[PDB]
Design a protein around this ligand. Structure first.
Ligand SMILES: Cc1ncc(COP(=O)(O)O)c(CN)c1O
Ligand SMILES: Cc1ncc(COP(=O)(O)O)c(CN)c1O
Lengths: 396, 396
């Protein structure tokens, strides 16, 4: 049965992890995978998480099944994060949340859902985008088409091209938008632009699907949700896949959620029972741990007050490294202007390096970055900034 | 988009959970979902698990991504459980394990794998079987056919009918076998029978797929694996989906694994890279917690010595309740012989109650059981045994 199986090519992102610990060469620098690192190049588990975990160890009395959609309070706390405590969506009971194994899992369950219970055939994804978007939607039998987004020359959001590309999407097609911290460009629409697309979207009849994996990494919790909230006030239905892997440092615990929004309580409820059926046939019910942690933190002011500060620290250190990288590059004689980098939000900078340059950086200097030239700024520290910048300069 | 969505019917198993806490009527008894309960009707978290969790809280320094196939030691410890420490499969490096969100998740990833990289079109499932088997395989686009298994009259394994049904399966079809504690009949093949099927399977060219969710609940760890081990010594390729939800009391942490076996190291490795691609497009990487616990327990003799005893206690209490149920039924004037129940292994007894009887038991007495007449013996206690038995007798 397996004699004919061809080997799949290594994952463009997760594959770097293998190569990185395959070459024992002293000063390697890992700027590939999107994981936060502190000034010492460590990925620590947050203090609030350690506190919440202790509490759980004290108070849990059972590991009995969670129920298909997970922990209620979790689902409730996430909607308030996404839509706002006031929000009519919450009051009209128009939204339903399922706890899922990470944002990726939320994208898959949404894909499986749309594929079996809807007439969706094609999903529109930005160009460029996170590489795994294609694979997830293709796994569910949906088709992926690309819409223009980034202006390489100016390092700008090519809005006119975005608008003009989307014009080929028909009523009933799904359009994927990144909530904030666009992966991998780091360029997001302004609120005015989010508004224009909110409206264009209602006239052309597209079903919006937001990928929210970095809430809190651009300007703040409530600000990063503005675009989504602009859409929810104007739309009757929409899906949102959010992740807690980055903003809670819970990467390997797989914590995320798929939020379904419909016209009214009765409708979202019917639609949701099918989403639950799709979960049952996939992984049955979600892993409790990571989600329990998030819920306990969110539910306790002391704990939540400490978390918001840890999040604020993460974001600020990244903004620091961002400006340092640019300054050291100019200091090291980079034959180019990299100022645009300071303008990007989130963990990544679309550096502009060519495939060949990133290949040489790795083989020659032990510097790891994604083929597309995406570099993890959050992996930069005052200690590796100089070796890194010299590697880059000797490659331009 | 959602105006037309029809509501999915409630899950035949997980749906009972809703109904049960929907009726506030004092003496309700829950014999539906397969969860272990101790003499006081509680589902406690195991002591070894509490110990392992404390250790993890002390020693974990990061929640960084786990890598598509999960924790190595976990994968390694599971293969030794399944195949045995000696085993040529392990020494020849013919097996590859992926850590997955529960046994259900392992069944899905195996389904997705077989569907995209193989010429499998149909999966053979016993009649009766765990209800979610159909849905998982149908989610992946595979077809499910049923093979005769249980003799209702005699409460025996209708081997001749089993053999005769399987004769319609062609070379290249997947046949699902339950390792031990057949859900829901509790009747398993003898080793001699496992042997006959091991051989019949090689001549007819079927790809075996074992569902192992109750290892340790029949007679013991190594004994419950005998059938599988009889097959692995005779087969060149096979897949095994195992679960740790019951034997480790880790239900909601979602801990299981999908083990792939091929002719040689080079082949299993090529095949496996595709299995990894299927995981990446589903949930990316598995939840660490539950699996870390299992690995720490398995890796430490003190901890593992305590676990094996807790498992032994669970199994023994069930065997106790099994004989008590039968004795109280006869004591309460049951107009029938229920002796066959003592002969069944695992958590469930196929009682023989009709759909109508189980419907009446619920509405009239607050006694919850699955439509098929499957009752959770592990949910019986000396305290509810009498109310329960009277409910049943007044329904025969
Ligand atoms: C845009 C985007 N969407 C979803 C995810 C998947 O996140 P998770 O690791 O939570 O599964 C990521 C990973 N960073 C992402 O960048
Ligand atoms: C036969 C069988 N297979 C798989 C599973 C799924 O187990 P999990 O809860 O580990 O996902 C179960 C549930 N008891 C089962 O009974």
């Amino acid at each position: 049965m397996f004699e004919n199986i061809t080997a799949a090519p290594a994952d463009p992102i997760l594959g770097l992890a293998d190569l990185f610990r395959a070459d024992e060469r002293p000063g390697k620098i890992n700027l590939g995978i999107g994981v936060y690192k502190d000034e010492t190049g460590k990925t620590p588990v947050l203090t609030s998480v350690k506190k919440a975990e202790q509490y759980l160890l004290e108070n849990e009395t059972t590991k009995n099944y969670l129920g298909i959609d997970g922990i209620p309070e979790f689902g409730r706390c996430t909607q308030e994060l996404l839509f706002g405590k006031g929000s009519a969506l919450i009051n009209d009971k128009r939204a339903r949340t399922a706890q899922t194994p990470g944002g990726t899992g939320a994208l898959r369950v949404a894909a499986d859902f749309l594929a079996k219970n809807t007439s969706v055939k094609r999903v529109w994804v930005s160009n460029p985008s996170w590489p795994n978007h294609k694979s997830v939607f293709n796994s569910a039998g949906l088709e992926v088409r690309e819409y223009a987004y980034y202006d390489a020359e100016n390092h700008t959001l090519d809005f006119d091209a975005l608008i003009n590309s989307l014009n080929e999407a028909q009523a009933g097609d799904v359009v994927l938008f990144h909530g904030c911290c666009h992966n991998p460009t780091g360029i997001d629409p302004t609120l005015e632009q989010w508004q224009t697309l909110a409206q264009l979207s209602v006239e052309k009849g597209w079903l919006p699907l937001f990928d929210f994996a970095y809430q809190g990494f651009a300007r703040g919790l409530e600000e990063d949700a503005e675009g989504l909230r602009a859409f929810a006030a104007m739309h009757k239905e929409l899906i949102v896949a959010s992740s807690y892997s980055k903003n809670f440092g819970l990467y390997n615990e797989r914590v995320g959620a798929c939020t379904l929004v419909a016209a009214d309580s009765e409708t979202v409820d019917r639609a949701f029972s099918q989403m639950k059926a799709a979960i049952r046939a996939n992984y049955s019910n979600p892993p409790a741990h990571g989600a329990s942690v998030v819920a306990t933190i969110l539910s306790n002011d002391a704990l939540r007050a400490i978390w918001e500060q840890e999040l604020t620290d993460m974001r600020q250190r990244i903004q620091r490294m961002r400006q340092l990288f640019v300054n050291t590059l100019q200091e090291k004689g980079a034959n180019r202007d990299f100022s645009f980098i300071i303008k990007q939000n989130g963990m990544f900078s679309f550096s502009g390096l060519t495939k060949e340059q990133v290949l040489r950086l790795r083989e020659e200097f032990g510097v790891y970055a994604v083929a597309s030239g995406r570099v993890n700024v959050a992996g930069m520290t005052p200690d590796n900034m100089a070796p890194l910048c010299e590697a880059i300069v000797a490659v331009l």
